[PDB]
A paper describes a structure:
The [name]-box protein [name] is essential for pre-mRNA splicing as it plays a key role in the formation of an active spliceosome. Human [name] (hPrp28; also denoted U5-100K) comprises 820 amino-acid residues. The helicase core with the conserved sequence motifs corresponds to the C-terminal half of the protein.
Here, we report the crystal structure of hPrp28ΔN, a fragment of human [name] comprising the entire helicase core and a short N-terminal extension (NTE). The structure was refined at a resolution of 2.0 Å and contains residues 352–806. In the crystal the helicase domain adopts a wide-open conformation, as the two RecA-like domains are extraordinarily displaced from the productive ATPase conformation. Interestingly, the defined arrangement of the hPrp28ΔN RecA domains appears to be a favourable one as there are many intramolecular contacts between the two RecA domains, e.g. a salt bridge between Lys382 and Glu640 and five hydrogen bonds (Ile379–Gly759, Thr381–Gly759, Thr381–Ser761, Lys382–Val788 and Glu614–Ser790). Moreover, the conformation of the P-loop is affected by the bound sulfate ion located between the proposed binding sites of the α- and β-phosphates of the ATP.
Numbering used by the authors: 352 to 694, 703 to 723, 728 to 806
Write the structure that this text describes.
């Protein structure tokens, strides 16, 4: 009976639905477990008074979408992959948790007599982008007494060499310049607890993968988070963030795309990162995780069962192409001891209620966001496919769409391939991407 929009409510009134609408309003898609709620406004945020004062004085009146969601994850010391393009407020999204961390260290702990390099390094692919980041970092950092030094090309080595001697809290750099400096020990990463790769896809495109690898090799290994479920446990990671000086490092990667090289970087640099993806409200394929299995038709039922046996978050939807399929597949599942609905309102209530866990259906209303869509039969055109996978929701948890492809589906391979190659939240599937039938438009 309370039908207010969330923006009419106080923070402590926010419901699950309100958070869903909220993420829809800002086009916030995520991946990872136990994502903290996004920031509704600066005032509504739990940022320290002095931090908010600097935010307010710099003029940033409202958090941008990436800032809304990434900032709270960063404040739990969690790694992040942020999918968003320059101009979207990425820089402040990563700068803010760092500034909270630095300026809240005990003075006794902020004390070091010898110069031990930066608390943070921000790596950019180009001199032009690095300077943008620098200007913004200075404007945030100076009021807070935080020093920033740029290690980039296009600047004198005297000036650069000098500035280095003075000590700093943040270094902004380009890969080529940074490796040379490390290789000559003009700078060390002894107290670095914050690693940022900005435009990692562009770094890859420029040929910087090996240099970015070699740079990682200079970070002290013993401050990396453990590779376990604990790396994305909020209670534990929050307690680690607050642990001040001795926390695990955190790493942030920003990129517009996820080709395999970028995924390699991520596997090395990051531990159980959360994904924050902004945009594509109208284009589900860009923002829904898609997986495909090529098989013969006779293999479909056993692959489905194997998938189901792995367990799922009900409800899920399985799509088939013909209504007879719908009915017979549904029977078999109820035989395997599954609660299956076929496809009026009555069906969705049970699903919504938890009664039924699996909806079987053809391309033919209105239904909740689902964790998983399975295309047991692939759609006959890419527009129907798009509409199907769109059922994981407009925003919020990416969800997963799993598609069974056979040779009878060859006429949608090229467009299916495009749908996935344009999906930064999806892994490139060489089985389809390299397939002889996915190379040219059909007809
Ligand atoms: Hg670093």
């Amino acid at each position: 009976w309370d039908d207010r929009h969330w923006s009419q409510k106080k923070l402590d009134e926010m419901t699950d639905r309100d958070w869903r609408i909220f993420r829809e309003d800002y086009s916030i898609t995520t991946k990872g477990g136990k994502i903290p709620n996004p920031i509704r406004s600066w005032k509504d945020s739990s940022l320290p008074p002095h931090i908010l004062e600097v935010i307010d004085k710099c003029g940033y009146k409202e958090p941008t979408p990436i800032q809304r969601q990434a900032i709270p994850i960063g404040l739990q010391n969690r790694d992040i992959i942020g999918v968003a393009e320059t101009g979207s407020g990425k820089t402040a999204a990563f700068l803010i948790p760092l500034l909270v961390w630095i300026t809240t260290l005990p003075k006794i702990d902020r004390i070091e007599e010898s110069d031990q390099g930066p608390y943070a390094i921000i790596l950019a692919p180009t001199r032009e982008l690095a300077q943008q980041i620098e200007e913004e970092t200075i404007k945030f950092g100076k009021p807070l007494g935080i020093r920033t030094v740029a290690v980039i090309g296009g600047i004198s080595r005297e000036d650069q060499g000098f500035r280095l001697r003075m000590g700093c809290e943040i270094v902004i750099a380009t890969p080529g310049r940074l490796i040379d400096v490390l290789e000559n020990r003009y700078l060390v990463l002894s107290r670095c607890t914050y690693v940022v790769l900005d435009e990692a896809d562009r770094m890859i495109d420029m040929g910087f993968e090996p240099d970015v690898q070699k740079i990682l090799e200079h970070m002290p290994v013993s401050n990396q988070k453990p590779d376990t479920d604990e790396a994305e446990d909020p209670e534990k990671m929050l307690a680690n963030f607050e642990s001040g000086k001795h926390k695990y490092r955190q790493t942030v990667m920003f990129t517009a795309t996820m080709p395999p090289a970028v995924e390699r970087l991520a596997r090395s640099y990051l531990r159980r990162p959360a994904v924050v993806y902004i945009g594509s409200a109208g284009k589900p394929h860009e923002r829904v995780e898609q997986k495909v299995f090529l098989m013969s038709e006779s293999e479909k039922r056993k692959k489905l069962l194997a998938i189901l046996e792995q367990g799922f978050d009900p409800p899920i939807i399985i799509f088939v192409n013909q209504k007879k399929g719908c009915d017979v597949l549904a029977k078999s599942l109820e035989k395997m001891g599954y609660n299956a609905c076929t496809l009026r309102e009555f069906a969705l209530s049970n699903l919504k209620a938890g009664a039924k866990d699996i909806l079987v259906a053809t391309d033919v209303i209105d239904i909740q966001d689902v964790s998983m869509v399975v295309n047991y039969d692939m759609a006959k055109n890419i527009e129907d496919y798009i509409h199907r996978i769109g059922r994981t929701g407009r925003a919020g948890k990416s969800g997963v769409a799993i598609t069974f492809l056979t040779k009878e589906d060859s006429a949608v391979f090229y467009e299916l391939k495009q749908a996935i190659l344009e999906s930064p939240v999806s892994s490139c599937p060489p089985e389809l991407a390299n397939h002889p039938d996915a190379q040219h438009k059909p007809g």
